[PDB]
């Protein structure tokens with residue numbers, strides 16, 4: 025069985041004082057065993073050392089991004105080998121905000137995923153379609169193209185988690201149903217089965233990166249092809265604990 | 274007189290161990306008084322807390338970049354108010370590598386400079402032309418356009434330093450002379466005098482962001498319109514101290 029996976033993407037948020045409160049809340053949290061849920065928290069770069077040094081050893085830390093290749097003359101960028109040096113085990117790559125606002129191409133994201141895996145990082149690789157793309161009938165064309173750019177550059181999937189972001193439901197007034205999440209997760213897993221292998225499809229976590237809260241986490245988590253969540257805003261809040269508890273039997 | 278300014282841009286380089294060695298070397302350095310030189314060091318985001326907590330209080334820390342506006346849903350980005358929270362006083366904005374490789378437009382850079390200044394950061398604002406631009410006769414057209422995008426968005430220049438990067442001499446086999454640096458600095462200061470004010474032109478540091486080393490720092494530093502340096506690779510090395518010492522009488 026695929027181990028339920030809950031990632032918390034803090035995005036471009038936080039102060040030393042708020043990070044200390046968030047970490048203190050996660051440290052005091054009582055959640056399902058390490059055998060039933062894998063928990064990853066992703067602060068901004070400048071708080072990665074603070075979080076890694078103070079967070080409970082059974083929760084894991086992710087960067088929100090890293091550079092496409094070896095460090096050097098890339099002012100403003102953080103290399104995968106910097107994260108490895110700081111004992112940061114995870115990285116989020118290809119988040120919808122970087123694809124849309126920072127114009128990260130599917131090929132750029134694929135190159136990042138390959139380089140991060142080569143340096144020993146574990147990767148949350150993000151995909152997802154816009155409202156225009158979904159309304160054009162392009163959902164699986166887009167998600168397959170984005171996934172293919174990663175798959176063409178990846179030889180080992182052990183350290184990959186795919187996050188599906190329904191960008192079409194994020195800020196548009198459109199709401200994704202658990203059935204709509206399940207449909208994309210199922211079609212994406214079928215795509216992995218045909219284009220990579222049956223093994224990789226059966227063992228790769230595909231997590232839901234739409235609007236996740238205490239109200240919807242159990243119904244979403246119970247979907248056959250949803251293996252967990254990449255949580256946004258709720259990741260800064262005690263409610264993140266309730267979302268981790270979606271793993272419980 | 275304009276206070277000589279030496280910035281060290283570490284770029285996408287460093288490990289905890291190497292940062293500790295670099296900081297220990299700067300802490301042991303014996304350089305001209307705070308009255309004659311202002312020294313700024315710019316590590317990657319993930320090392321800003323380590324450097325700020327351990328670096329001598331008379332040297333200052335800069336981020337290599339920050340986000341264009343208020344933080345929030347910008348996965349991978351670091352806001353100016355995050356840097357202010359961590360007591361990081363400086364930021365480098367519009368570095369040639371971000372303009373060229375990350376496609377930061379002159380308007381994007383100008384917006385960043387305005388937002389960073391609004392949050393209380395001091396800014397090293399970078400400009401400079403490519404070999405193609407220089408060989409086309411566009412040097413001052415390009416540098417003026419880049420500076421104008423910043424100037425159109427800035428009302429107070431007290432906390433700005435302009436860095437001229439001769440991108441045309443950085444990796445091309447072309448070498449910039451001190452006379453060539455002086456010509457651009459002079460034309461850029463004249464531009465500030467006409468387009469902003471005589472006061473702003475007379476008081477704004479314009480630093481040279483070309484190839485700077487112990488061999489050339491005194492001749493470059495002595496130019497009438499060169500007020501210091503934005504150093505690259507040498508900023509990781511003991512040689513950075515010799516470049517700071519270019520301030521000496």
Ligand code: NA
Nearest residue numbers: 245246247250
């Ligand atoms: Na499930």
Ligand code: NA
Nearest residue numbers: 494495496499
């Ligand atoms: Na000078």
